[PDB]
Amino acid sequence: RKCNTDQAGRPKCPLDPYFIMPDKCKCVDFQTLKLQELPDAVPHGEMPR
Amino acid sequence: TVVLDDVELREAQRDYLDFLDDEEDQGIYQSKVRELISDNQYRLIVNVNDLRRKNEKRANRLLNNAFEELVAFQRALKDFVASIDATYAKQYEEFYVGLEGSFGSKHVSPRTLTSCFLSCVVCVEGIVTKCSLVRPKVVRSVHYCPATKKTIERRYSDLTTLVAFPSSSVYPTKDEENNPLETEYGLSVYKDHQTITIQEMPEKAPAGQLPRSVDVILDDDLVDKAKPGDRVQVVGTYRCLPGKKGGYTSGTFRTVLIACNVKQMSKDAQPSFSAEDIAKIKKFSKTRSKDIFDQLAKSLAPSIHGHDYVKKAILCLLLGGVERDLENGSHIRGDINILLIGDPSVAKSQLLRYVLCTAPRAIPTTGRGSSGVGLTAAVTTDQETGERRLEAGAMVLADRGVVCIDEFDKMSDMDRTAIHEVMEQGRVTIAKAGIHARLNARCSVLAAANPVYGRYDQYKTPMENIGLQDSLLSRFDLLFIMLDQMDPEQDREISDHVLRMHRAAFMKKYIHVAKIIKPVLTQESATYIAEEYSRLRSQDSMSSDTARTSPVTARTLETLIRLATAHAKARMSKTVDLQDAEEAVELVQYAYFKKV
Amino acid sequence: TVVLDDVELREAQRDYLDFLDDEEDQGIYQSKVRELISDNQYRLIVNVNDLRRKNEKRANRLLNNAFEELVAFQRALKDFVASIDATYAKQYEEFYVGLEGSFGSKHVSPRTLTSCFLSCVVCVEGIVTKCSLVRPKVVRSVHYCPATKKTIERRYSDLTTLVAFPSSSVYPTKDEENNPLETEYGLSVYKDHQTITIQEMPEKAPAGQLPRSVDVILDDDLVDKAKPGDRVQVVGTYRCLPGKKGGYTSGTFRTVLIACNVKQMSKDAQPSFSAEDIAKIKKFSKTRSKDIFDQLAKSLAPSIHGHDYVKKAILCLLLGGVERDLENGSHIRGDINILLIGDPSVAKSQLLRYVLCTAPRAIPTTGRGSSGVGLTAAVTTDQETGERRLEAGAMVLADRGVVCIDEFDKMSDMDRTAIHEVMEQGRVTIAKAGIHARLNARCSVLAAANPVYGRYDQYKTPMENIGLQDSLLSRFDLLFIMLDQMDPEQDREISDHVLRMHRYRAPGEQDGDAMQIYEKHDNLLAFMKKYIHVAKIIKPVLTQESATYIAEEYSRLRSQDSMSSDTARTSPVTARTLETLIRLATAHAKARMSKTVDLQDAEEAVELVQYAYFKKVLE
Amino acid sequence: LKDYALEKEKVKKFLQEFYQKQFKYGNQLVRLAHREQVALYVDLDDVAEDDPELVDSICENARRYAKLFADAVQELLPQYKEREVVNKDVLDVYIEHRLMMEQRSRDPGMVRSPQNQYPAELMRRFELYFQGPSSNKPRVIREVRADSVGKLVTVRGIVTRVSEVKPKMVVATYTCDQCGAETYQPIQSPTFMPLIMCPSQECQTNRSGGRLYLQTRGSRFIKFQEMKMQEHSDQVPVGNIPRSITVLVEGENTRIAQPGDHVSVTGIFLPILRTGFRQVVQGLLSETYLEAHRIVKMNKSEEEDFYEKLAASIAPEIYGHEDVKKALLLLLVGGVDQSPRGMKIRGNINICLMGDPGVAKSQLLSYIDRLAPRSQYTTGRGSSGVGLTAAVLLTLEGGALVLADQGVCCIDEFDKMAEADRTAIHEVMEQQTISIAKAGILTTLNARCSILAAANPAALLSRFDLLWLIQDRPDRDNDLRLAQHITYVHQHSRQPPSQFEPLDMKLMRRYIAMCREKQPMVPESLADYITAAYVEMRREAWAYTSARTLLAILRLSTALARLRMVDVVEKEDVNEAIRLMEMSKDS
DNA sequence: AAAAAAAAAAAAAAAAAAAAAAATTTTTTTTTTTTTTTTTTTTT
DNA sequence: AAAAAAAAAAAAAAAAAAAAATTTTTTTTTTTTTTTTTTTTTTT
């Protein structure tokens, strides 16, 4: 929430100066899986975790 | 700030201008730039294979870095077309490039497209699923001050996948001294804007998997290039969209594909024309004309033995008649429809699949594969804007083409009642509460059906062997019977041919030009067809033990006219002569009379 | 937000393109453009009366709202000078428009520079007070990234007067990849910048009131055109300044005057000529070259009677001798210096006021008005940098000029000795611990002393009767003795002259209420300035005959026999008197426009000294 | 906008290929590699001898090319390096150790970040400067303006003040309290902020502080001096005061200029950003200094009868006074400074010209001022108070006497000076020092100067070594001769041709220095004769004199030996010295 | 004519005015995706 | 005639987006004041 680049004798950059440059990033995939308790491993009376 | 020196940009524009020059080396891109100039187009298309052939390192830079190299490319094109022409380059303000060819590792599907290809030029297969309403995005907005009588013009830029601050995208509403403005819409500039949603092609996805989809963005001269259900292949830049002003970011960067080119399936290949093609087809037209149709039908589907008359009829449907439209608004259709029917193992589905492989705009369907709403059009609800919407069925997609129905007898009767529209009119009058429509579905129908009782009963009349009514058989212009004649020489030749085949392009060229051709019929043929149909419309035409197959009608006369015109299209004569009329007479006679 | 068209700007630029278009007229502004192109100067001075007569409405508009109007003017100027020469017009990113003329209501003084004249080109006379260091200001700054082999040119807009934003004021130092950027100072572009402070003149200002001053920002083209103490007329745009950013403001708006041009208000650098006037001077010289010195001498200082030798001598001063700077810098002066000593009411001070009004860069010094540190230069610290600056004195201001010393007798011995090196070598070598310098004041001195006892006693010797040392009277090169003979005959002479001048009136201009080479020969009775100004430059070398004659006459003067008994010397004949002979000879030859000092001028010089120096004390 | 790599290869080509045939710059590069030379001076005339457009680029863009030349020579040193340096300086030991350890842990294939490197100036141990092209015209400090910023100007002026050599940071060095890796911070601004946290890879990986501490020991400094140069009087316009430029000196250019001398600086004009001020105008202003690349001292700050020959060549404008000229030449050459037990005796003559007006006392005085190597000139109340002595500005800076230390002070209107200035002058004559004890100052400044005085008519006789009455009295023949001389001067702007042309001032200063460096002895043989002469003049004066008179005779005799240029003091030397004293008496 | 005393000048130090400089995340909304339920239309 | 597939409509929840926001302190500048030097002026 602060532009650190200070230039003397000049008014400062505003309060929330930063915008996320999308061209220059490093991005990697990600997958949100759902795992379930093994049906054999589940006890008799119980819903799977 | 303004850049004064840039080794990368300067060498990029130099290399591009060198490549796009091409006049000294075979004039490929000289011809292409002259073509887009004459045709008044400004989105060049560039073979990346040729780019690799000339300057391979430049190609790798282009692929592995998209936006910079593409900006350099489009500006080099601007300078190049500026050299070749002045007023044209002044008129059009920015000259786009699109990419094409082979994209080895980057030719992917929406499944294999990972984040590894971010900011790079991908070539994505797969169908279309969404098509947004096309909208103009303002790019140069002119305003007029009523009080001051001065005109200003704010500008904008394609900040689609780059950093964007509010200053760029402000739009004026007040003058510097609080004197409200009036925008000049006409003097402004605009860029249409559409967004489609490609999905992995339904067959190519691994089975039992929810499919993967990728969004695509489209702009000027690319918006109405692909409707839903198009087997598109989009070449474009895969990038990230910035989630607007944050203060907290999850780091989850949504992605799009800014399309730099859009293509359909290559089969609709009407432009494939060249000197060799015209030379050979002119030879075929001129050196022989009395046996064009016979030779062509003989070589039509070489794999299946015999079926001489039926294959001739297949060719009649393929070429088509001539659509005769009237000044009054009446329209007499020009397209033949055919119903194969025969014993099992008489290659009915193989003729169908032959048409599906060869003809342009050929749509498969199987008996209960499509039920009504699939075959004809359907009316759904948008569910976002509330309005209705039309979903084009197989027939509508097949307009000016062919639909091949397999297991036509086992198709439900409701579907046939639905296609009662199309089988003569070529139009579907779909309608629900909020939308009435009349959709051009003008396309031939080839069909395959097995007879009732599983196999054709040789000792019963065709009306009893067919589980279809006089109405339906009349809607079909042609009905054909095929029976496995178990004669010794027949079995010898069919099995020999089958084993022989167990051990074309000129036709594709010929079919669509012949379809373009529009002959007209002679008075000799006119009298001949009138008296021949009069001969047919009589009990004396038939005899005991030779029952008719379909209820003979003015439809029978009309489809004889279509057959004669189709044979004229085959002959390229532009004159439906007595030869064509006689041949159609023979065809309709054999198709309509069968023994008992 | 580029403007497509504005009727106001288009109209104004068309009007001023017409105004610059001078071919159907006499070609004045076209000639101005051509000469400034030849000069490489890039400001053109447009007379406001010209603008008013050709279009009064545009003059009203411009003198009411300057900056955008002058933007139109300067764009028209760039287009016009491009049509004359596109190559030169491409050379400078801007060209400028100075002003001149009758700024009738727009002529005020810094006391009367009210808040009515904002954004209006105001005209204002006044004295400078400060001269800030002329330091660069960056306008277009170029940078080089060595990591990426990149170059950039950040651009700056001279928003000295408008609103200025940090986005405009950024000086880049890193690329997008956070690489280091190295400034390219040479490839960048700069313009000088100086602040000064004009002040209401104390001769003009109200008597009992504090000074009032206005700040003036001279950007490029006007760097050193105004030093402290100078009289200067500044014409330019009074405006407001932006307070630096901050959520609060008091209403205060400290204001400036961004000068459009500044000119020397002295109006004494006046060589204004025409070719006809040059020919007039040339004929005036050559036709009667031999009598021309006496023509000038009789002419000079009308409204006074007799004193013909003194008029000749003041001509020798004003025309000047010729300064000599030999091979090794042995600088032998070329100025005359005259001491009027004489009874009261002998128009000595009137001669002084004459040369004050006529000679360019003339300045008065009183006995105890000016004093030493005031007379010659001074050294004082800054107190804003603790550095020793130099404050040029009266003589240094009068370098290559005239100083009129009223009541020279009353300057105390300290100042009378402080004037020594300016009297001889025309320099003041000043120094204190920080800074030292040799300020150059090649001055000329006309000094009106008064005698001891308040009036000359005829029988007493001049050395007794002058309260001045032989030491100083050596340095003075002429001492002229002006006695009031009190005879009725010469009294009739002087009286008729004086009362005629009391009767002379402004010809026709007045009714009864009180406040060309030759002159129209008014019975009751300009080119002087023209001719003496051109005369100053010539270096008439001495002939062999003149040098031998002047040498022998000097030897005669040195010998005591040349003065008879009953006469008393007024100034001892040191070698300064010989150099006086040479300088007076050169001044006479310069009057003649000779190009050589001849025996005529030599004998005139010897006549001058023989009358001036040796006095006949009577018994 | 030129390919700086291409230009770098071109400057390499020039440095390697230049000759004159001796390979000037090649030999200098060998000396550099051996560390027998701490600064290299490029000559732009030599550059333009092959590539004038390169000189054009340098002059239009100097500091860039200072950097490029420095980098190119750095790259070129190992090519010419022959044998290992002897590691003279602790700095050289540091660079050798750093090169050792980086080569040890280099991992030659491996690639490292740009900041994991030694700052390019940290390893130089050689400066590079430019000697400006003769094609450029020496500017004037008013004319050098914003359009010269970043350009290699050539300027001339008098140095009026200079600070003492202070050490200036160029690359601060720091050491972590964790990772044992030095850190380096280059310096460009006049001021800087010192780092706190460590950017070393180990510190960042371990996520420890690494609060690095500044080391004055492993850092680089360069000698830093600043001088205030200003315009000559002659090139000021008519009404103005001379203008000044702040020159900044560093490296081997320091300790050249001292307050008073005349210099010519080839220097890169540059700005400095203005911070800590509240002006009117927006944008960026800049105090401008002049980086000094080449300081030179110009003009006065650079034959059996040789005595009479040189003596008649002083001030050939002024006529006559030939024996005054002889005495003045002795005042310039000086005597000898002997070093006996406990006492030291000054060896400087003092001369006073008491005279009638209009005898060119001031002309002789000014000629001495301009001729003498280290000279100063005072005229009455121009330089009084603390104009002769020193005052504090804090820093103690000298007046006329301190400037003329080891030199000549030329005082005009000696009689009319203030009482305090007269007292200070008396002390300088007696002991060659000024003992100031004012409010802000307590000092014993060393003011070693021969004093030449002018005045017009007891303290003077008692103090001074020689005192000359020059009184004009009229005479027909001699005033004719003077008139002929001065009028010839006013005609031809030159002296009348004597039998020999007067010698040039440059050669004059050369011979004065040569004579000054030739201290002879007084023999033991001549003690008898000189004692005899002294006692004789005591008889004559008894029928003013004192031990000062004997010391004057001795100093003049030693000066005469110096001028005679060989051997020790002799009969002829004492004879001529007593003749000069006797002619002062006859005056 | 030179010494003593006084006045003014030069330079350093201090007190207040007024214009500049610096610091500075968290809670609510709301669109979009997904699921669920009742109904009508169509098929067995 | 009963079953079921599809359609539209309604609701919940998670991700992204929206919106709200002056006060205290420091530093330059100006202006006077005081000390001490220098200068000038009056006295014997």
Ligand SMILES: Nc1ncnc2c1ncn2[C@@H]1O[C@H](COP(=O)(O)OP(=O)(O)O)[C@@H](O)[C@H]1O
């Ligand atoms: N006349 C023929 N010549 C060659 N092969 C034939 C012929 N008739 C049928 N076949 C073969 O029968 C096989 C399947 O026939 P198909 O098209 O499925 O007929 P149906 O649709 O009646 O089952 C194909 O492999 C085809 O080659």
Ligand SMILES: Nc1ncnc2c1ncn2[C@@H]1O[C@H](COP(=O)(O)OP(=O)(O)O)[C@@H](O)[C@H]1O
């Ligand atoms: N030579 C003269 N010719 C004419 N009028 C003179 C002359 N000398 C003096 N006067 C008159 O006497 C007055 C003396 O004034 P001013 O010169 O100021 O005093 P002073 O002569 O004592 O310097 C002048 O106004 C002038 O009118």
Ligand SMILES: Nc1ncnc2c1ncn2[C@@H]1O[C@H](COP(=O)(O)OP(=O)(O)O)[C@@H](O)[C@H]1O
């Ligand atoms: N012997 C001489 N030869 C040449 N010029 C002389 C001589 N004596 C005097 N002068 C001239 O007299 C002028 C005044 O001399 P100046 O320097 O004032 O002496 P002072 O300063 O002692 O009065 C000078 O321009 C000088 O050239």
Ligand SMILES: [Mg+2]
């Ligand atoms: Mg089948």
Ligand SMILES: [Mg+2]
């Ligand atoms: Mg003198």
Ligand SMILES: [Zn+2]
């Ligand atoms: Zn560390």
